[PDB]
Design a protein around this ligand. Structure first.
Ligand SMILES: CCCCCCCCCCCCCCCCCC(=O)OC[C@H](COP(=O)([O-])OCC[N+](C)(C)C)OC(=O)CCCCCCCCCCCCCCCCC
Ligand SMILES: CCCCCCCCCCCCCCCCCC(=O)OC[C@H](COP(=O)(O)OCCN)OC(=O)CCCCCCCCCCCCCCCCC
Ligand SMILES: CCCCCCCCCCCCCCCCCC(=O)OC[C@H](COP(=O)(O)OCCN)OC(=O)CCCCCCCCCCCCCCCCC
Ligand SMILES: NC(=O)C1=CN([C@@H]2O[C@H](COP(=O)(O)OP(=O)(O)OC[C@H]3O[C@@H](n4cnc5c(N)ncnc54)[C@H](OP(=O)(O)O)[C@@H]3O)[C@@H](O)[C@H]2O)C=CC1
Ligand code: SF4
Ligand code: SF4
Ligand code: SF4
Ligand SMILES: [Zn+2]
Lengths: 48, 289, 206, 146, 114, 155, 176, 94
């Protein structure tokens, strides 16, 4: 890279990170989608 | 309910049981069976551990991916207790040694720690709280172990009134300190099987009638300590001052308290399971009606 | 034409002539003979003819199919005899191959061919294991590929892909236990077939 | 395109009223025990049921059977039909007896008090097909809708 | 209705093979319990064999019975030869499966399946 | 002080145990071949103190290198139960990590972590011999973090 | 055409017979075998000094996956699901919807790296060079869950590795 | 457009976050929530509109065979710009 440096981009990490397994910085998977079924919310005022 | 904790599936490893349980003292004899049963049906289990991560590796295969979560905690640190319980729906306390150490005596593990868990759990909003005491808990007891249990039982019931308190006799099982205790060596004992105790705890989590109640988990039969010990050596083809006090304490009889049969658990005789425990060490024992 | 597999008429004619040869000699058992456009000869026979037809092909001087390349089954649920048993034989003397095919169902036994080829021993055990076809007079018929005590025949078209049970180590009983299968992610079925016919030459009359 | 309405405002849990008079989630055991207690304390005309517009036949007969066990006949729908005369005794009284495919053989259709375009759009599409390919004649009594 | 028999030409001859297999299994259970150091009693092992046999008491096809016997003899061979391990023998007892209730109300509470 | 003593005793046994990791390899399938290439001269696992062929009686780490079928699961658990402690498991390749390309098969255990506890997962089908070496060196660092004595002292 | 590997006639004249007798008693072939192992002791070994030295890899190497962007920073992926269709292991799971600006984009893009066979079929099938297998092969983890990548993990891999990924694609795309 | 919720958890570019009563956020306790902070929706909006002198323009995303399939974008409407369906670049007629 001292001779042919990489193509600069806005989004490329400026600070490289080593493997983070086993530390507080480790990756934790989760579902990236939102809730699909909305439940009905009962009324707050009484009425029976 | 909350949409994420509605039960789904057929009650297996990949199912969703709806239980989010924090189990303190999960790295011991009772905790492994409790955690195993919780993960059998697909519960989220939080395991606060004081020990090495290496000593908690036997719990990893007990739950599908992501279902067993491990956190560090210190019994004296309230924040570390708060972190482990604020997302749970039930908190289970199985903390306790059978001996005192220079750092923790029986008051620390049977009064101070259970009360700290109960106080943090109540403040954090946990609805269900299960606390394990002892059948022979008594402030008039010769054993400092059993005297501490009685005090901690009182403080738990006053700090978390809805807590379900369970009072088992000595528990026999593969890793127990009871049948294995004898095999490595006036009183009437009524020991109970480890799996029965585990089912009782699980059934208490699922039963609304168990909230606020105290149960006594005892085996189907009462034996004379001498007769039982003779059986152990026959099956196996063959310590502290306080420990001896407990082993010599006749098992209380508490008819007023509910028991395993109330939680739908049929107690298991020691004779069906004695070989299981004692085969590794290689005629019945008179029962008291 | 660079992209098209060339035909071989010499081999096609030769395999057709041997197809008639076998059919004329064993009319008691041969039900059909065909040669594919890529020159493979198939003899379809009645299942009673397994031993006679294979023995003839192995020992006859103008056949000499000494090697049993493979022996397998095919489950076709629409047929009343759902199982098709395929013998692929190789002749070193004449540098040729032949396929012999028969059929059976879940209950009819097929005669074991171990007397004709010792290679058939394990192949027939595999067929029993994977498909549930029983071979009569086999010197040692038993499962070969599946777990001991495994229920079912996994290669049948109606056996589910992931089976019925799955294993895990249970710490309570201190052994590997079997339980009904639950999948964190179900296998996703794809409907890939296009609704437009691709090969007019294979159209079936309505 | 209405199927997306199946994803919102959904009833997902049994609910009963609390001491505040507000609906609160509860288990199937609790909700059904409350309903059964009330059902066992009433009989005859004291118990009724109204069926909505999307109810299936298996639920309709089950509910009929249950109220009959307490000797109630008040099984009602929301959509009126005159009970005078035969009422529902004879199916032909309340059916489209010609069938949808029968419109293609009619030569005159009289539409009385209805807007088939919005009430039965595919039935109205079947009339237009006859109107187009068979020169079907159509007369309407009611508002002059498109 | 003309079919090739497996072993037995009618249900009488088939029932004889069933009884012989049952005797072989019955005599084997004490050995299996000891050889595999099972935690079940010999009585439980024998009641299991009996329950496995009664499951198929309703068959009337001599060919189906013959296959059931052929499979049972294979299972017996795998047990006698100690080709099975202790895990295999104990899969007959489903020891880690929570009892699944069979009445309507219990099924209704838990889920959708019949 | 006693803190400083256990700090150095921890550093000593931890240094000894990660400088002498003796594996026994379940070469179950493909991934065993890449495990052999890690023993081969280019990478020479033996130069890290990781002996090539070790009996199960003297093994410290188990490497599950390949698909674990249902028929083999009982045998895997047997060997694991016989390993003397401390013992660690490295899961090598997609098959052992979670079933991999046979995940939906009827005869395949969907991840060896259903049978035994696992300390390191090495991804790849198969991981390169150097990728497996990275996982072994990552296990050493995991051992280096152990603190059995400091926790024992604080009991 | 064929040849014989072991069809030789041992001479039975006295000179030949004594040659085999001296071989038997003086262990000549065994000592010759000792010479070969001795010559290797003095050869330079082929070991490389990992992790300070790395084995050589080519631009085509199939390693850890990453989701790429355009030079503007817009995601390349358009939720076409061709990668998900071709995946031999069914390791990819995708969900999509119109983005707030109306673009066709994914809301879910997971790869089960413990199902993946690292075959590279997904990067072949992708029409816009969105999903790639990068050059990283040193991402072993301590837990199973860490290997179940979602879209946030995959985009972070792309931003982390884009410098090298772009250079590798530049080197090999004329063979594709 | 990284944005934390009232509970403090960062909202992802897909709008995902665990609501207050969701136990599933226990998975982040003692660890972290992987969130990519380069929102593509915000980045493409930073690109200026190209001014072109024809009713139809083609886009391949740049880089020739390294971009996306080449498409042709009609610029007849004046109310809005023409957007590429692949890369989101915008074009307007002059
Ligand atoms: C007789 C007793 C002999 C005591 C052996 C002392 C061990 C020396 C040592 O730790 O090596 C330095 C080691 C070398 O560190 P290392 O093991 O991490 O190796 C680093 C170099 N590479 C990258 C090639 C692996 O230092 C330590 O890591 C700390 C351990 C100290 C243990 C000794 C406590 C006393
Ligand atoms: C003037 C009067 C004098 C009278 C006295 C005259 C005596 C001298 C003449 C006789 C020479 C005697 C030789 C003594 C050595 C033993 C020779 C011998 O036994 O060889 C035969 C033996 C088996 O050979 P085999 O191929 O199996 O055929 C025979 C089997 N039916 O072959 C084998 O031994 C098997 C090989 C085993 C060794 C393999 C591993 C080591 C090989 C390398 C070792 C190099 C030697 C190291 C020297 C150590 C020095 C300290
Ligand atoms: C010093 C270490 C020894 C190894 C290095 C020497 C290698 C060597 O020279 O061995 C080859 C030589 C010939 O071996 P071979 O071709 O089998 O015999 C045919 C005629 N002698 O082998 C020999 O002829 C050596 C004879 C060895 C006998 C002396 C040992 C006693
Ligand atoms: N088993 C029996 O015979 C009976 C047991 N009980 C009660 O059941 C509960 C568990 O029984 P058992 O499982 O046999 O007890 P164990 O000793 O087997 O396990 C005790 C648990 O408590 C934890 N623990 C102990 N002291 C501390 C501490 N100071 N700080 C934090 N964690 C601690 C241990 O973790 P670590 O591994 O880190 O020490 C372990 O997980 C106890 O409360 C016991 O009194 C009641 C009646 C009979
Ligand atoms: S993970 Fe890949 S290389 Fe390893 S055994 Fe499975 S298929 Fe073979
Ligand atoms: S590399 Fe192959 S197995 Fe892995 S995600 Fe891509 S297509 Fe699927
Ligand atoms: S990564 Fe490529 S192939 Fe996969 S959905 Fe996105 S655009 Fe389509
Ligand atoms: Zn574009």
């Amino acid at each position: 890279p001292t001779v042919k440096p990489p193509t600069a981009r806005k989004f490329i990490w400026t600070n490289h990170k080593f493997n983070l397994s086993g530390t507080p910085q480790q990756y934790v998977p989760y579902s990236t989608t939102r809730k699909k079924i909305q439940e009905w919310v009962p009324p707050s005022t009484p009425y029976k | 309910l909350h949409h994420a904790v509605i039960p789904h599936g057929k009650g297996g490893r990949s199912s969703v049981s709806g239980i989010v349980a924090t189990v303190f003292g999960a790295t011991g004899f009772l905790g492994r069976y409790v955690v195993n049963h919780l993960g059998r049906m697909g519960s989220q289990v939080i395991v606060p551990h004081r020990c090495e991560p290496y000593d908690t590796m036997h719990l990893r295969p007990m739950g599908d991916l992501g279902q067993i979560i491990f956190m560090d905690w210190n019994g004296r640190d309230k924040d570390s207790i708060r972190r482990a319980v604020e997302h749970s729906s039930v908190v289970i306390n199985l903390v306790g040694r059978e001996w005192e150490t220079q750092n923790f005596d029986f008051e620390d593990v049977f009064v101070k720690i259970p009360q700290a868990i109960a106080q943090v759990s109540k403040e954090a909003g946990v609805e269900k709280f299960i606390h394990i005491s002892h059948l022979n808990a008594d402030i008039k007891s010769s054993s400092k172990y059993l005297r501490s249990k009685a005090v901690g039982e009182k403080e738990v019931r006053e700090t978390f009134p809805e807590a379900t308190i369970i009072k088992p006799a000595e528990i026999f099982g593969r890793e127990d300190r009871f049948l294995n205790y004898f095999a490595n060596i006036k009183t009437v004992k009524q020991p109970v099987y480890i799996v029965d105790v585990t089912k009782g705890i699980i059934n208490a989590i699922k039963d609304p009638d168990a909230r606020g109640k105290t149960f006594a988990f005892v085996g189907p039969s009462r034996y004379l300590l001498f007769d039982l010990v003779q059986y152990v050596f026959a099956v196996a083809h063959r310590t502290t001052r306080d420990k001896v006090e407990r082993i010599h304490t006749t098992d209380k009889i508490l008819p007023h308290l509910p028991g395993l049969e109330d939680l739908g658990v049929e107690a298991t005789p020691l004779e069906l399971k004695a070989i299981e425990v004692l085969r590794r060490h290689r005629q019945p024992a008179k029962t008291i009606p | 034409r660079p992209t098209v597999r060339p035909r071989n008429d010499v081999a096609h004619k030769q395999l057709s002539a041997f197809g008639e040869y076998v059919a004329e000699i064993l009319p008691k058992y041969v039900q059909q003979v065909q040669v594919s456009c890529f020159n493979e000869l198939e003899i379809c026979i009645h299942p009673d003819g397994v031993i006679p037809v294979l023995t003839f092909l192995r020992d006859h001087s103008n056949a000499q199919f000494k090697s049993l390349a493979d022996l397998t089954a095919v489950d076709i649920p629409t047929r009343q005899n759902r199982f098709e048993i395929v013998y692929n034989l190789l002749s070193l003397r004449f540098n040729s191959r032949i396929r012999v095919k028969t059929y059976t169902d879940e209950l009819t036994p097929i005669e074991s061919s171990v007397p004709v080829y010792k290679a058939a021993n394990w192949y027939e055990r595999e067929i029993w294991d994977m498909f549930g076809v029983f071979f009569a007079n086999h010197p040692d018929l038993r499962r070969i590929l599946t777990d001991y005590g495994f229920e079912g025949h996994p290669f049948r078209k109606d056996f589910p892909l992931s089976g019925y049970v799955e294993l895990r180590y249970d710490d309570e009983v201190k052994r590997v236990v079997a339980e009904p299968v639950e999948l964190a992610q179900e296998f996703r079925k794809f409907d890939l077939n296009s609704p437009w016919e691709a090969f007019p030459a294979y159209r079936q009359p309505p | 395109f209405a199927y997306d309405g199946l994803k919102r405002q959904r009833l997902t849990e049994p609910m009963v009223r609390n001491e505040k008079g507000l609906l609160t989630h509860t288990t199937w055991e609790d909700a059904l025990s409350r309903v059964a207690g009330m059902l066992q304390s009433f009989q005859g005309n004291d118990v009724a049921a109204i069926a909505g517009g999307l109810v299936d036949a298996e639920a309709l007969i089950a509910l009929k059977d249950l109220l009959n066990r307490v000797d109630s006949d008040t099984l009602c729908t929301e959509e009126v039909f005159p009970t005078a005369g035969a009422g529902t005794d004879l199916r032909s009284n309340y059916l489209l007896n010609t069938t949808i495919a029968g419109v293609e053989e009619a030569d005159v259709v009289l539409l009385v008090g209805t807007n088939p375009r919005f009430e039965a759009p595919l039935f109205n599409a079947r009339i237009r097909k006859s109107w187009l390919h068979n020169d079907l004649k159509v007369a309407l009594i009611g508002s002059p809708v498109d | 209705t003309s079919v090739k028999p497996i072993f037995s030409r009618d249900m009488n001859e088939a029932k004889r093979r069933v009884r012989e297999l049952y005797r072989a299994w019955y005599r084997e259970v004490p050995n299996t319990v000891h050889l595999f150091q099972l935690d079940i009693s010999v009585k439980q092992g024998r009641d299991k064999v009996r329950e496995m046999f009664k499951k198929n008491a309703h068959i009337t096809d001599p060919r189906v019975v013959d296959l059931l016997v052929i499979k049972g003899k294979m299972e017996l061979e795998e047990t006698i030869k100690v080709w099975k391990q202790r895990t295999h023998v104990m899969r007959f007892f489903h020891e880690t499966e929570a009892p699944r209730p069979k009445d309507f109300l219990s099924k209704f509470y838990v889920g959708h399946d019949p | 002080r006693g803190e400083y003593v256990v700090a150095k005793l921890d550093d000593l046994i931890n240094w000894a145990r990660r400088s002498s990791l003796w594996p026994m390899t379940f070469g179950l399938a493909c991934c065993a071949v890449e495990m052999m290439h890690m023993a081969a001269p280019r990478y020479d696992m033996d130069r890290f103190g990781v002996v090539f062929r070790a009996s199960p009686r003297q093994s410290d780490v188990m490497i599950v290198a390949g698909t674990l079928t249902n028929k083999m699961a009982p045998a895997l658990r047997k060997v694991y139960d016989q390993m003397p402690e401390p013992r660690y498991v490295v899961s090598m390749g997609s098959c052992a990590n979670g079933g991999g390309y046979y995940h939906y098969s009827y005869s395949v255990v969907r991840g060896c972590d259903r049978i035994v506890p696992v300390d390191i997962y090495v991804p790849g089908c198969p991981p390169t011999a150097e990728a497996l070496l990275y996982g072994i060196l990552q296990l050493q660092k995991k051992i280096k973090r152990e603190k059995r004595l400091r926790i024992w002292y604080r009991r | 055409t064929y040849k014989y590997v072991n069809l030789r006639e041992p001479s039975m004249d006295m000179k030949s017979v004594t040659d085999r007798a001296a071989q038997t008693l003086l262990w000549t072939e065994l000592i010759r075998g000792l010479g070969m192992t001795l010559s290797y002791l003095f050869r330079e070994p082929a070991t490389i000094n990992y992790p300070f030295e790395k084995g050589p890899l080519s631009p085509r190497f199939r390693g850890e996956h990453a989701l790429r962007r355009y030079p503007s920073g817009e995601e390349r992926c358009i939720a076409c699901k061709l990668c998900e269709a071709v995946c031999p292991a069914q390791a990819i799971t995708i969900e999509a919807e119109p983005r707030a600006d109306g673009s066709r984009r994914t809301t879910r893009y997971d790869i089960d790296m413990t199902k993946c066979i690292y075959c590279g079929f997904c990067q072949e099938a992708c029409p816009v060079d969105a999903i790639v297998e990068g050059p990283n092969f040193e991402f072993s983890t301590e837990t199973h869950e860490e290997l179940l990548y979602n879209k946030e993990k995959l985009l972070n891999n792309g931003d982390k590795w884009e410098a090298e990924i772009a250079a590798n694609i530049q080197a090999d795309y004329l063979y594709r | 457009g990284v944005r934390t919720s009232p509970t403090g958890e960062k909202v992802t570019h897909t709008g995902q976050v665990y609501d207050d009563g969701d136990y599933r956020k226990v998975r982040f306790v003692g660890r972290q929530k992987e969130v990519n902070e380069n929102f593509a929706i915000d980045l493409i909006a930073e690109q200026p509109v190209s001014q072109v002198g024809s009713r139809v323009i083609s886009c391949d995303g740049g880089g020739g065979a390294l971009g996306h399939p080449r498409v042709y974008i009609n610029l007849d409407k004046e109310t809005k710009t023409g957007t590429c369906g692949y890369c989101g670049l915008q074009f307007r007629q002059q």
